[PDB]
Amino acid sequence: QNMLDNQTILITGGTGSFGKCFVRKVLDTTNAKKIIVYSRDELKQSEMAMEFNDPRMRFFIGDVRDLERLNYALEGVDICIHAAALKHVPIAEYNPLECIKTNIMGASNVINACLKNAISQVIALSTDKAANPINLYGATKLCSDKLFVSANNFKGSSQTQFSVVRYGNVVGSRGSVVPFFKKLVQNKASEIPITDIRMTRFWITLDEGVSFVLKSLKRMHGGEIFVPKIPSMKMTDLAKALAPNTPTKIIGIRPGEKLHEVMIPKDESHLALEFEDFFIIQPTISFQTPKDYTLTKLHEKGQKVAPDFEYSSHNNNQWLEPDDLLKLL
Amino acid sequence: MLDNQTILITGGTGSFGKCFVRKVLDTTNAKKIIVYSRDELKQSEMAMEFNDPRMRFFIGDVRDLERLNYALEGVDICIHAAALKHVPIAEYNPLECIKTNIMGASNVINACLKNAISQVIALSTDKAANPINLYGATKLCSDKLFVSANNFKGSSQTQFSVVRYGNVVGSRGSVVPFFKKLVQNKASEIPITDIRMTRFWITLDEGVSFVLKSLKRMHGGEIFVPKIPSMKMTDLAKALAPNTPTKIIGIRPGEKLHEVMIPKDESHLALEFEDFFIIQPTISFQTPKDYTLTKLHEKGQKVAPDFEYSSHNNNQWLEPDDLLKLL
Amino acid sequence: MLDNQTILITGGTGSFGKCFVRKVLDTTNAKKIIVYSRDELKQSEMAMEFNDPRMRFFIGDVRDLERLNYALEGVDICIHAAALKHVPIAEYNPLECIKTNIMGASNVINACLKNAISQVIALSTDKAANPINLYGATKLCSDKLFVSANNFKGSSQTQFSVVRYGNVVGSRGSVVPFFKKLVQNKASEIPITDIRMTRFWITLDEGVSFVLKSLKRMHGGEIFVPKIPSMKMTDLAKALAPNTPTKIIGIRPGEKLHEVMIPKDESHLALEFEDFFIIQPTISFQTPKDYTLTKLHEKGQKVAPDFEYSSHNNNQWLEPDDLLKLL
Amino acid sequence: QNMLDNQTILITGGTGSFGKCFVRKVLDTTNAKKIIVYSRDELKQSEMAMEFNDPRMRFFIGDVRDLERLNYALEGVDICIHAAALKHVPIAEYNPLECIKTNIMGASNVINACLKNAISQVIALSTDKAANPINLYGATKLCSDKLFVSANNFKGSSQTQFSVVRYGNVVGSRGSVVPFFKKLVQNKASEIPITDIRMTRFWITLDEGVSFVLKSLKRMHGGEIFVPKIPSMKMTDLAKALAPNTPTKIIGIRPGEKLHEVMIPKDESHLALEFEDFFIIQPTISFQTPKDYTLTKLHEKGQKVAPDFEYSSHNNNQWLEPDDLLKLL
Amino acid sequence: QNMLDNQTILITGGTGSFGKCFVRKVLDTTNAKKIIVYSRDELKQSEMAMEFNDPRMRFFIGDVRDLERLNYALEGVDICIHAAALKHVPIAEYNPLECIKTNIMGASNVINACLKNAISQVIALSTDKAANPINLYGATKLCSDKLFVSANNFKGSSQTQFSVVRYGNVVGSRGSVVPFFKKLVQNKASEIPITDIRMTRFWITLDEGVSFVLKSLKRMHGGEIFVPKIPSMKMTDLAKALAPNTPTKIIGIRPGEKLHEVMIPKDESHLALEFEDFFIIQPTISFQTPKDYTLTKLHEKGQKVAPDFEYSSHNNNQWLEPDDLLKLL
Amino acid sequence: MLDNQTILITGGTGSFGKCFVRKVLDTTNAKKIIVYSRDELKQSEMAMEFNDPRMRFFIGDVRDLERLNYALEGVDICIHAAALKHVPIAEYNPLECIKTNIMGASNVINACLKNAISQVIALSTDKAANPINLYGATKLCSDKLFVSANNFKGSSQTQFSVVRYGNVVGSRGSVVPFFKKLVQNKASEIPITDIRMTRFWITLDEGVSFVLKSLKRMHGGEIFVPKIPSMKMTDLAKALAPNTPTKIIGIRPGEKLHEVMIPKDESHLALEFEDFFIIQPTISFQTPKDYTLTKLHEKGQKVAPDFEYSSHNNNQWLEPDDLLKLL
Ligand SMILES: NC(=O)c1ccc[n+]([C@@H]2O[C@H](COP(=O)([O-])OP(=O)(O)OC[C@H]3O[C@@H](n4cnc5c(N)ncnc54)[C@H](OP(=O)(O)O)[C@@H]3O)[C@@H](O)[C@H]2O)c1
Ligand SMILES: O=c1ccn([C@@H]2O[C@H](COP(=O)(O)OP(=O)(O)O)[C@@H](O)[C@H]2O)c(=O)[nH]1
């Protein structure tokens, strides 16, 4: 059908929530020649291998902190999706160096190995927590994003493309709150943990995130930070539609948590280009051979935003009602 | 007090470094002051400049853990000022900035714990709050490492704190010096970015003073922020060179319009004092601490629910004339 | 005794790990129990599960010596259970298994000696005796490193011992659980390898108990082996799901027919006790030891010249009914 | 004459007993273009250079623990023979990590460097002590064997072949007992150290081992563990034919020593294929592109063994009498 | 005009005294396609970028102790000039390991990266202090010189050439005495630091050194140690012509300082070839494919020197009078 | 004194090593002598040769810091004799020579300081003075590292000194042995380089004696040089095999005609004693020292302004007959 046919793809952190959904989508909707899962845990890999049991799959035990392992794993790969990461904010506050080794040094290693093996396209997953970050996790992702964007300056016998995909909370992520709220009410809940009233968070489904990454692959030139237009939901309605029969206590705010998440910093608007269903944050730096981010590879046109624009979760027009939420298993 | 104590300063040959060393020699009884940095040229010139037997120079890189392990032997206080701070160069050389600022912080922490240092103060920047540029992001990572380092409880107790302030009036590579280089020479154009641009301003000497004061009242874990004035860049021009044309070049790479010192999202962690703030740790140390009362028995009060210490809404600014009283 | 002592368990989020932590909290006065492992998901879930102030979680890899050096500060006892144990995955990712199991053992040993740990027990496996698969070979290398580590005689004395046992009834990824996943669901075929296949069987709780008992009587250098029953796989089928068809798939990669616990070639090193064996070190420590008498004054006797503790000639087996009394 | 002509060969541990014999054989019987000796000791290399003084020789000082050194040394090499190792069983029991660094990490490094330089064929030397091992040395060799076999899965622009050659004790090896027994009786012996009566060990000559490695090069597909059919000798007759004029005291059994050495584990028979003068143990794992180990490159046919077969030193039919032994200087 | 046109050049330590002069010369007199400055300090690089502000320039922050950084920086480079170093003799005596890491390991890393990226020509800067050295700095440079010369033995798909350029004190170097003497008399001098009467040092201008390096590029075969014929000046006349109005105290001799610097050791004469304006010290070792150092690439002929020759600063015929010295700003 | 002290010798299986070990066992009360080297063959043969319970053998490389850290635990004196010394092989394998001799010195120093060794003596060579070959250059770098290491002043004080002497009569790989291998066999040609060639000559036993004496009087920082005779190579021929033809092959790679022991450029640093010299450090230690008076209260005098201790102008030579009285 398209660009993914006959291609070999490797995804770091492939056993994760995004990873399994992405792998499933690629196997179902493309004629990819091979899909390589690269992660550390033998348990999750053994079970994922049984779950998919697809001969197009390959499982490599390995750490993104291990450059030599990455060099060997990326051999013969055409496309690399970087989803490996330590993302638990509070655990990242208590174990800062671990988050740094995995998220930052991990990014640097993947970049190095992708260049060495002449990969064609690379997309690293980012987070809104990386825009004007306050927590350690967010700062490591910002460093990662900067590394990937800057990697486009390089120019070997083959010019590898590196882009970033940034979006917010995933509805009911592997460790999200949705899957947490359902476990409570299920195990006979009598109180739900809440943080703040005016709280706000962008929301997108796992499948939409995956589809967004794949579409970004088709339109990317390299160096872009892709941001999808997604609705916002106040935590108030979230708990009511997932447990209206039990009360909620305003527990203490987690370490390093924001009230509202930023998607596009006000100070970076001048780099932002708006499109129909997404935004593109252009590089702050200039490369050897510039790119016209105004027109994607899919011939889509984008227009600069307002010099004062700022994609925040509280100044958004899209809001998902308690209904469709329940429509998300 | 540094009374007959041994102090080591990473990046000691830099602007902050030389000023700090001068102050320590002149105002304390430190028995030894160690400069740890890479450049043999600057260290040779500094040695001749500070021809004092209390000085000791170690050529070394903060990316070199073994070298730091050796240099920090017998040290009581460590001031960490080594860094790559050029924002645009950091955007073009991100991994280099990460190696020096982030891994450098990790190595300093490791070497300080191993040598049982008593107190450590790392220098931060306002660019580390709600950062948008790479330099700022590495400094935020550095700050987090130093704050978190307080959880260790080995043999000798080691305290780690951070000092965060803005632009240093006429710093090494700063703008003021850049303009004094244009005014004293046949100029005609004053490079400018925006118009609403604002920044916090502190002098090199005030920075050094604040670090010294921070050492005396730190418990370990604080990010100390001094109350300093803000100044619109449309005044620093009508001061360093009035009656002169200024062309609006525009915003620079990874640059903000206003710098933040204390994020609104962290106000609840902030404690106000007469002339400074303390941003408390986001984590809980096995051995808790009360930051409401410094070692100097100074009392601090929590701040308003939506407090925002920014260079745009500062309740104090510098005068275009008092600005020249620094140069 | 763990009386107000600090204990750290590598791979603490695993099957053995969670069971061990529960036992220590409930049956001893350990002041602190530290979990050292890589996964933030399992540690976050375990923290909520074991919401106890005596717990402490460190994200870390046993391949990271610096991280272990830090995490083992102030620890008295270290239980080493971190490992890559999936035989076929280890055959396809040999260097990964070697890095974790072998280098991991070397790093743990190094960090324990540096932090002056008192006692260390590493978990082994019957697959490490006369091994044929890679996993088994790395565990044998790990066992040798831990036994040899006893030759060190620095500041504080550190004892290192190994605990070796077989298949853990319904372990994480085991077969029993795999069958309980087939029986409770629309099944029709029970995957089987051989017919003469046999294995030793010990419960998770018995494993944890044996480790605790090993700590109390170890001198350092022993490979402790518990006397446990054997069970032919043609019974584990006529128990977990009788009246059901079982297809003979065949032997798996790097798999044996019978597992060995004490090799005939090492019998001369074995000492028998009422309910366990001690395989003495092959080397002579500068500071000798008498393994015939444990710390618990238990007496052990040498074994027959051609003794062979295998899962095929075991003088005790599990009943197809007592087998279900575990599940 | 054959496959070795005009080829560049590098042998790690080339100054050793196997190494010197192998180098001598290659120089004498082939038109190899260049032979590189890679080892650590300047003494043995300087003397070996004087002993051979052949312009086709090249001597590289280097450690197999040093990956960067190996990468540089294997540049331009077509065939790599891996014989470097720490093999003294008791010393390996007292210095386990050293044996592991050299034997295991050394194997990993050689593999990495051979792949990087696109070597064509690689043979690593193994030992019967690596089959159902009880000592540390044997376990490290088993890990090494597993690494080399597994290295065949890789597939770069050039598919390097990796096979293993496994055999027992070498008659009068550099540190063997034969050369030990002759030094005793020579220095006026009056007592010979013995371990156990029923003891048993496979025996092969240095020259036969070398010839076997070279022949394996001609028939290998990559992934095989070559095992030669060799006779067995009880230690009883060994001491009598090498010192019948002096007594022997049953000294204590060395640390980590077996009574009988295994060549092919009973649990691996199902992988074993018998031939006229040798056996082939097939990989336990399956590669991308399978190989028909039933037919060697020399068109030799092999048949599966008995599902209960086990090549041990005590169940062997071949036994060398005290005569031919003395015929081995 | 010549060999440098359309070529990409990288100079380590490019922000230094030699570095800026070399870069300036290459930009002014050649049609080089790109010039890369590789050094650690962001301050000197930012200011050098403003000073030259030439689009043909590229600035890489990096350390020669960092192999991975060098591998990335030398990608696409044709010529590499190695000028990075720690050269302060007394500081090198007090910080020996630092000097060793930068000068020796730095040399090894540059060589490794140049080979990996198939650079065509490489010239490392040496010093007369490296001939029969007595101080640590000089010993590290001798080790460096030996590494570069030996690197010519290697032979990959592309045979990179490595040569060395050795000369003495640079008139008024970044930290020299000339710039020191002018600062004293300027800041009202009343006493000048002197070491010894019979002192002697070779002298060459920065511009001559740069021109010599560039000319060496045109004539080199690889493996040579280029030495320029330069005059000698006693320290007596140096202080008088730069400050005859103030006295001088015979301060203590710096740590590790010689009285006279050697250019060509007497024991290496047999390797030396004399030319009109320079000398060539041939390799002490023999390569695979020899070179005829008797004839440069510029068809210049050289003749062997006297078996007892020795280029010292005190047995030189060329001597610069106090006049021309002042002619050097 | 080595009275019940623990001594470790890197490169202990070498010529110097075996002689040193024999002397220490026979003439001192050292409680333990540790051999640290790489080769299992030589160590196994040496163990059988020196079947003495006071011996301990560690397989290890001086390029391996972690391994040295472990092996030097509990050591009081460290003799560093590990090296790659073949001049022409070092010319062809420069980085290997650099790794062993230079990095090896740095690792030994690091491990000695960490384990609080009391005294360390590193072996140098006359080829390290005004060197022309790579081997000599690495040894000069090694010497400088050891001298400089004395600036450290951590917990336990560690002294580092160097012992420098020339060719060892009939050393492992030397010429004398090479000739004894030609004389005892059907020879006819005696390989020769030059004619004016000269060298210093010391016996293995005199070297070992000098090291032992150096330990007793060292303060740390000295390069000890013994007063030894010189011998023209035109005599070593008319001794090891007279009435035989010698072909003039010529100068070898990186070889000098005369070796220097004390450079004229360093005379001012030299102090003369009855039978040896001390070359003082070029640097000033924070804690100064008076090398004019050894620990043995021996007095040394400065030397002449242009002193040059070379093998060509030596005031003493060996007799062609007394030369054979060594063999
Ligand atoms: N399982 C059996 O049937 C069996 C039988 C005989 C003996 N044993 C012994 O029991 C021990 C533990 O077995 P188990 O069943 O409890 O295994 P498990 O359930 O797989 O737990 C092992 C744990 O080790 C951690 N780990 C893996 N690699 C690590 C690394 N590189 N650094 C740090 N932590 C790492 C993993 O946690 P993270 O993913 O969070 O890192 C994992 O949870 C083994 O060592 C084995 O010798 C087990
Ligand atoms: O001092 C000794 C050493 C060894 N052996 C025996 O000789 C055989 C070979 O020993 P060696 O050290 O030559 O080789 P290894 O089998 O340990 O590789 C073994 O079966 C030992 O039992 C012996 O009788 N006396």
- Extract the tokens encoding D86: 């720490």
Spot the catalytic one: E33, E101, E116, E129. Answer: E129
Q: Are C267 and C307 in contact (CB under 8 A)?
A: yes
- CA nearest to F260, candidates F287, F305, F220, F225: F225
Burial degree of C116 (CB within 10 A; 0-12, 13-18, 19+): middle
CA B18 to chain centre: 14
How far apart CA D57 and CA D23 sit, in angstroms, is: 9
Q: Within this chain, do residues F118 and F237 fall inside the same structural domain, yes or no?
A: no
The reply, when asked if residue B41 is annotated as ligand binding, is yes
How far apart CA B175 and CA E203 sit, in angstroms, is: 40
| Look-up of token digits 């650079």 | E119
CATH of the domain at D85: 3.40.50.720
How far apart CA B202 and CA C180 sit, in angstroms, is: 69
The reply, when asked if residue F163 is annotated as ligand binding, is no
- Extract the tokens encoding C230: 């054997």
Q: Are D206 and D171 in contact (CB under 8 A)?
A: yes
Spot the catalytic one: A34, A101, A129, A327. Answer: A129
How far apart CA F277 and CA F303 sit, in angstroms, is: 10
Question: How many A/E residue pairs have CB atoms within 8 Å?
Answer: 7
From D191, D254, D263, D325, the mutation candidate for ligand 2 (largest count of ligand atoms within 8 A of CB) is D254
- CA nearest to A248, candidates A175, A189, A294, A177: A189
The helix (H) or strand (E) run that includes residue C49 is helix C40-49
Total domains in chain E come to 2
The reply, when asked if residue F171 is annotated as ligand binding, is yes
Contact C59 A87 (CB under 8 A): no
Cα distances from D200 to residues D132, D136, D196, in angstroms, run: 16, 20, 9
Q: Within this chain, do residues D252 and D122 fall inside the same structural domain, yes or no?
A: no
Q: Within this chain, do residues B52 and B146 fall inside the same structural domain, yes or no?
A: yes
DSSP string, F150-207: GG---SS--EEEEE---EETT-TT-SHHHHHHHHSSS-----B--SS-EEEEE-HHHH
**How many CB atoms within 10 Å of residue D228?**
22
> Residue E79 pairs with which residues in a beta bridge?
E9, E121
> Residue A295 pairs with which residues in a beta bridge?
A301
- Extract the tokens encoding D13: 């541990």
The helix (H) or strand (E) run that includes residue C198 is strand C198-202
Ligand 1 centroid to residue C188 C-alpha, Å: 31
- CA nearest to C210, candidates C267, C275, C260: C275
User: SS3 for A80?
Assistant: strand
Which segments within E13-158 are labelled E, that is strand? Answer: 34-39, 57-61, 79-82, 121-127
Ligand 2 centroid to residue E302 C-alpha, Å: 64
Contact A93 B151 (CB under 8 A): no
State if residue C62 touches ligand 1 by the CB under 6 angstroms criterion.
yes
How far apart CA C146 and CA C140 sit, in angstroms, is: 10
Q: Which residue does chain B place closest to A252, by CA atoms?
A: B268
Which segments within A197-261 are labelled E, that is strand? Answer: 201-204, 225-228, 232-233, 248-250
Contact E112 D76 (CB under 8 A): no
- Residue F70, Ramachandran bin (φ over 0: left; ψ between -120 and 50: alpha; else beta): alpha
Domain that holds residue D24: 1-168+205-229+262-312
- Extract the tokens encoding B162: 């951070």
- CA nearest to C8, candidates C44, C49, C38, C37: C37
Please name the residues in contact with C178: beta carbons below 8 A apart, sequence gap of 6 or more.
Answer: none
Question: How many B/F residue pairs have CB atoms within 8 Å?
Answer: 8
Q: D touches B (3+ CB pairs < 8 Å)? A: no
From D177, D178, D260, D312, the mutation candidate for ligand 2 (largest count of ligand atoms within 8 A of CB) is D177
Contact A156 E72 (CB under 8 A): no
Chain D interface residues (partner C, CB cutoff 8 A): 90, 93-94, 96-97, 100, 104, 108, 131-136, 139-140, 142-143, 146-147, 150, 153, 253, 255-259, 265, 267-268, 270, 284-285
Pairing of strands B270-272, B276-279: antiparallel
The reply, when asked if residue B45 is annotated as ligand binding, is no
Q: Within this chain, do residues D9 and D109 fall inside the same structural domain, yes or no?
A: yes
All residues of chain D having their beta carbon less than 8 Å from the beta carbon of residue C150 are none
Q: Within this chain, do residues F183 and F51 fall inside the same structural domain, yes or no?
A: no
Q: Within this chain, do residues C156 and C241 fall inside the same structural domain, yes or no?
A: no
Q: Within this chain, do residues B189 and B265 fall inside the same structural domain, yes or no?
A: no
Task: Give catalytic residue positions of C.
Answer: 127
Burial degree of C214 (CB within 10 A; 0-12, 13-18, 19+): buried
Sign of CA dihedral F96, F100, F102, F106: positive
Q: A touches F (3+ CB pairs < 8 Å)? A: no
Sign of CA dihedral E3, E4, E7, E8: positive
Judge whether F264 counts as a catalytic residue.
no
All residues of chain C having their beta carbon less than 8 Å from the beta carbon of residue D93 are 144, 148, 282-283
Residue D114 sits at the vertex; the CA angle it makes with D151 and D168, to the nearest 5 degrees, is: 65
Q: Within this chain, do residues A49 and A156 fall inside the same structural domain, yes or no?
A: yes
How far apart CA B71 and CA B60 sit, in angstroms, is: 8
- In chain E, how long is the greatest CA-to-CA distance? 63
Residue minimizing CA distance to atom 8 of ligand 2? D177
How far apart CA C271 and CA C302 sit, in angstroms, is: 5
CATH of the domain at E175: 3.90.25.30
User: E touches which chains (3+ CB pairs under 8 A)?
Assistant: A, B, D, F
- The resolution in Å comes to 2.1
How far apart CA E152 and CA E142 sit, in angstroms, is: 16
How far apart CA B153 and CA B163 sit, in angstroms, is: 22
Q: Within this chain, do residues B135 and B278 fall inside the same structural domain, yes or no?
A: yes
Atom of ligand 2 nearest to the CA of D201: 20
How far apart CA D191 and CA D181 sit, in angstroms, is: 10
Q: Within this chain, do residues D237 and D285 fall inside the same structural domain, yes or no?
A: no
Chain E interface residues (partner B, CB cutoff 8 A): 40-43, 45-47, 59-63, 65, 69, 86-88, 91-92, 94-95, 97-98, 174-175
State if residue D227 touches ligand 2 by the CB under 6 angstroms criterion.
no
Q: A touches C (3+ CB pairs < 8 Å)? A: yes
How far apart CA F89 and CA F117 sit, in angstroms, is: 33
Q: Are F43 and F114 in contact (CB under 8 A)?
A: no
- Extract the tokens encoding B274: 């007469």
H-assigned helices in C200-316: 204-217, 237-240
Mutation pick from D15, D39, D42 vs chain F, by most beta carbons of F within 10 Å, is D42
> Residue A37 pairs with which residues in a beta bridge?
A11, A59
Contact F93 D60 (CB under 8 A): yes
How far apart CA A233 and CA A318 sit, in angstroms, is: 9
How far apart CA B90 and CA A284 sit, in angstroms, is: 12
State if residue C136 touches ligand 1 by the CB under 6 angstroms criterion.
no
Burial degree of A184 (CB within 10 A; 0-12, 13-18, 19+): middle
Q: Within this chain, do residues E256 and E161 fall inside the same structural domain, yes or no?
A: no
Distance (Å) from the alpha carbon of A112 to chain E's nearest alpha carbon = 9
Burial degree of C290 (CB within 10 A; 0-12, 13-18, 19+): exposed
Rounded to a whole number of angstroms, the CA Rg of chain E reads 20
Which segments within A98-190 are labelled E, that is strand? Answer: 121-127, 161-167, 169-170
Atom of ligand 1 nearest to the CA of C126: 6
How far apart CA F110 and CA F69 sit, in angstroms, is: 8
| Look-up of token digits 């004839």 | E295
Q: Within this chain, do residues B36 and B150 fall inside the same structural domain, yes or no?
A: yes
